[PDB]
Design brief:
Belongs to the BET family. With about 120 residues, the protein is mainly α. Helices cover about 50% and strands about 0% of the residues. The chain has a single domain, classed as Bromodomain-like (Histone Acetyltransferase, Chain A). The protein contains five helices and no strands.
């Protein structure tokens, strides 16, 4: 496999919690971004094989996508909201590191991030 293993969504050794903030991140934040017209390039790990990007996983050390975040939320992987927020932030920063500033994917990421930042502003 020329893709790395995806980021883990279950680990018996990692303690976990359900908090109001994590339920909000699932039911409101992820739910909103997931249903956005531009969600789909972010709904699964970057497939470097399918997309013919042999340098992607030479450059991006900490890959992250909303498919992974959705499973981490549903599977109770997280201890706190900040871990989940960091995963979103990483997904956006990775996009801005790898792609050119004028690229369509960066415009898609920017639209999702604006919605994200507004929902995080409203964290309970
Ligand atoms: C708009 O389509 C772009 C096209 C290349 N693409 C398709 C088509 C589907 C139909 O078959 C042809 C390929 N699927 C995907 C799925 N994920 C993608 C993720 C990124 C991406 C992110 C996010 N961060 O870095 C990168 C890099 C991406 O960036 C150019 C393109 C993706 C992508």
């Amino acid at each position: 496999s020329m893709n790395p293993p995806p980021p883990e969504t279950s680990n018996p050794n990692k303690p976990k919690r359900q908090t109001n903030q994590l339920q909000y991140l699932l039911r409101v934040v992820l739910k909103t971004l997931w249903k956005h017209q531009f969600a789909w390039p972010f709904q699964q790990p970057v497939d470097a094989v399918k997309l013919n990007l042999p340098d992607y996983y030479k450059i991006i050390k900490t890959p992250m996508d909303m498919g992974t975040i959705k499973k981490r939320l549903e599977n109770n992987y997280y201890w706190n909201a900040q871990e989940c927020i960091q995963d979103f932030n990483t997904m956006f920063t990775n996009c801005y590191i790898y792609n050119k500033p004028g690229d369509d994917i960066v415009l898609m990421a920017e639209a999702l991030e604006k919605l994200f930042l507004q929902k995080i502003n409203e964290l309970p």
